[PDB]
Amino acid sequence: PSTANGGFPSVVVTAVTATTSISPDIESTWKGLLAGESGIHALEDEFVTKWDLAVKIGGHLKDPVDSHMGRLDMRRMSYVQRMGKLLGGQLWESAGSPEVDPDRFAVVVGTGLGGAERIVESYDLMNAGGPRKVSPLAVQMIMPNGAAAVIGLQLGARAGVMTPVSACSSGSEAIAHAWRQIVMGDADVAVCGGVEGPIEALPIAAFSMMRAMSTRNDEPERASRPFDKDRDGFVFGEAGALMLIETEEHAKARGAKPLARLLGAGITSDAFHMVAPAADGVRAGRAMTRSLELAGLSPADIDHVNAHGTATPIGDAAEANAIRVAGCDQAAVYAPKSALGHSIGAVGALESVLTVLTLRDGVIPPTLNYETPDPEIDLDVVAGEPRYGDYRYAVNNSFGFGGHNVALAFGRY
Amino acid sequence: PSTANGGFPSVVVTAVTATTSISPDIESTWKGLLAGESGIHALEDEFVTKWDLAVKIGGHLKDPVDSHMGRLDMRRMSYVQRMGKLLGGQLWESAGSPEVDPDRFAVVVGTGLGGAERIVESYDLMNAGGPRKVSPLAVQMIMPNGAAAVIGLQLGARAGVMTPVSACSSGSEAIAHAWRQIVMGDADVAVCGGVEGPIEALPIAAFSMMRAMSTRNDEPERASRPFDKDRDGFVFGEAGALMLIETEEHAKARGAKPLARLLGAGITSDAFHMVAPAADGVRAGRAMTRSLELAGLSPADIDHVNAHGTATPIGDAAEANAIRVAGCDQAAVYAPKSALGHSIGAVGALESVLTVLTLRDGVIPPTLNYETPDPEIDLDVVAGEPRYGDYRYAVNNSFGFGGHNVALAFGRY
Ligand SMILES: CCCCS(=O)(=O)Nc1ccc2cnn(C)c2c1
Ligand SMILES: CCCCS(=O)(=O)Nc1ccc2cnn(C)c2c1
Ligand code: NA
Ligand code: NA
């Protein structure tokens, strides 16, 4: 059974929304990327100087979430819940605010951590003034399922509200599970993607102590260098992204113009290391292959790969092998983290949206800072200027800390 | 397409393990439940007196997790990761330490929050001595996928390692996603269940401030009263539980004796309120109905319902209506939280293990403290003494905060 042979129903993407370090509008982010713009700049936050952080570069949201948040929302929601509500409403507006059947409507939103800022706040409030100072809203804000719950409550999703956690692959895995919920018959329509918290001292400190982050502080826009010889780790780039997916029949019934097709989703694991990807990239490649199997495609059909491309030395090397294992080494490769950075749980979702626009507009943006290619890798990396091309099919890769491999297979409508 | 009509492959439960407030051995916990034992006692912890908490009753694990943990594990892992390692090894040994194909082996372990203690630790450390005092493993310990990532690395699962966060239904949802992974053909064997943190002052404060918790401190063992007229909220009971599921062919090939059959799983949502369940129980009942559709069963086939049964006035009323909607109100109902309390993300997995043991031994333990029937409920609640029977099929219910509904359909082997 596959999408090609009619074993699974046809699933199409009908709307996308995203907020990034370049722009709060996905179509503006897309234009910026095509122009070779970067969202990564020098961090001017006071916490950088306070702690004298080794990492002084980051990509803040161009339009911060809380600028669209009144006092009420600031009191009753965690940050990721607030981002979810914002993106949830924008997405629904862009889809024409359709009246769908709630019992056939599901929500699957991934996240890296959850409402962690409310944990420390409640911790502090209890330490200072005792258990009565902990809010009765604390549980619903802290719980990592909260963002998905807020969106499901907002839009009225009654065919399931799910939250997969797989670190960097959470946003892509969310879309994978949304696809599954539809193809198994549990829903006809689904909002899916990923949300994540902002850059701060403690996140910077924590990830910096892993020694996986770039420290090229003097040249922020040149710091993130996926598949480049002079790469020194990943760069934080704040993001949130959701897409609306549904059966082609459902889309056709309400007159929705599809942006792209979601043909298959592959989920595998390494069982190798807690934070480092497997060097051979076999299991990561198997995730790509599995998505092709479910889509009913062969590697030869894959014209484009939106790479995970963290810019860690071992990460990019592993992925290069992974693509080769999947037999997609002839595909045109893009590494959006070169310009948008790493948004952890949201990044798989943001990059899935980018893959949809690639297929829609038939153009791949240039991978920034790809000046001196790494001799070992040997990939067809799109760079210099955007590459216009006849892209029929694409695979979006997302590989998370813990050994989590998610591959999504998309097709041009 | 169903399990009955051969649409899905036959999936069987071949091994179980759990640590509870009654015992570290699942077979001993099971005997205790049949004898009418309770794991809920007066909390002798210092934080109870220190803060003068409204709740002074809880069920700590009989055998603490850390009593099996050395110095490396205590510094390199979070609590839920440590619980995961322990139960992971115990399950594998109970299964006969089989040599499975890692590429067809998956792990799905749910949890409520994650390595939350390491967040407040990192926060305190950084505030005291700056960013360099934060642990290098802070990220891999804090990340909520960490428990599942530990177990997948421990046992060598390469067909996917996933963590669903669904609050009270996390453990059940994990089994649900494990079932899905096997039936869609991505794996043949799967370790699945749930883990959760211990009882502490802040967890108590957070849940008790919602007025969700029982305050019957004078009589700890009589506090948790699911479906009883005089019920006043849930009681904390620490737990962790995992089960080994696999296809019947795979089980037969290695000579593994099945304990029960996993026939189907239904996942729906309320989209009603952030913490309160929907009064009508319609979507909760649809979760039950969906598990039957996929199992290939009818409501008449269901002889047993392992209820969510938290003992909240609102929660039990909703579940009573949900069972009516599913057409399962003539089924024999058991509420294990009466004796084992609420373990949040692990409780759905624990009660799935209890459902398996019920179908294996053909006996339902008594629902503790069910003395005065509530007029509104009108359920056949097993109480006073255990009820023996040739039980053919059972449905395990989990309805978590956020409106997440998971129903698991089990069958006698
Ligand atoms: C730009 C992505 C990095 C953020 S993180 O990976 O540390 N997750 C994260 C999640 C929630 C909150 C709330 N406050 N903060 C600071 C958070 C951080
Ligand atoms: C017995 C179930 C209640 C625990 S909870 O729902 O508050 N989750 C939880 C998870 C992790 C940790 C670590 N320390 N602590 C205290 C934790 C607590
Ligand atoms: Na990607
Ligand atoms: Na149950």
Residue numbers in the entry:
A (entry chain B), B (entry chain A): 4 to 416
Q: How did the manuscript describe this experimental structure?
A:
In addition, through MoA studies, we identify the M. tuberculosis cellular target of GSK3011724A to be KasA, a β-ketoacyl synthase. Mycolic acids are unique and fundamental components of the mycobacterial cell wall and KasA is essential in M. tuberculosis. The FAS-II system is comprised of four enzymes acting in a consecutive cycle: KasA and KasB, condensing enzymes; MabA, a keto-reductase34; HadABC, a dehydratase35; and InhA, an enoyl-reductase36. The FAS-II system enables fatty acid elongation leading to meromycolic acids (C56), which are then condensed with C26-CoA (from FAS-I) by the polyketide synthase Pks13, followed by reduction, culminating in the production of mature mycolic acids.
Curious to understand the molecular details of GSK3011724A binding to KasA, a 2.13 Å co-crystal structure of the dimeric KasA-GSK3011724A complex was solved. The co-crystal structure reveals that, in contrast to TLM, GSK3011724A uniquely binds within the large acyl channel that normally accommodates the growing meromycolic acid chain, unexpectedly trapping the open conformation of the enzyme. GSK3011724A sits at the branch point of the acyl channel, a feature thought to confer specificity for ‘kinked' unsaturated substrates. Within this site, density for a long linear molecule, modelled as polyethylene glycol (PEG), is also consistently present and perfectly complements the space between the compound and the protein. This sandwich of PEG and GSK3011724A enables the large acyl cavity to be filled, occupying the volume of the branched phospholipid chains previously observed within this pocket. The indazole ring lies across the flat hydrophobic surface formed by residues such as Gly200 and Pro201, and the amide of the sulfonamide makes a key hydrogen bond with Glu199. This anchors the ligand in an ideal position, allowing the kink (introduced by the sulfonamide linkage) to place the butyl chain into an orthogonal narrow lipophilic channel lined by residues such as Ile347, Ile202 and Phe239. Pro201 and Pro206 both lie within the acyl site and are in direct contact with the ligand. Exchange of proline for a hydrophilic serine residue (Pro201Ser) disfavours interactions with the aromatic indazole ring, whereas the Pro206Leu substitution introduces steric crowding of the ligand. An explanation of this finding comes from close inspection of the GSK3011724A-KasA complex crystal structure, where specific changes in the acyl pockets of the related enzymes disfavour the unique binding mode of GSK3011724A.
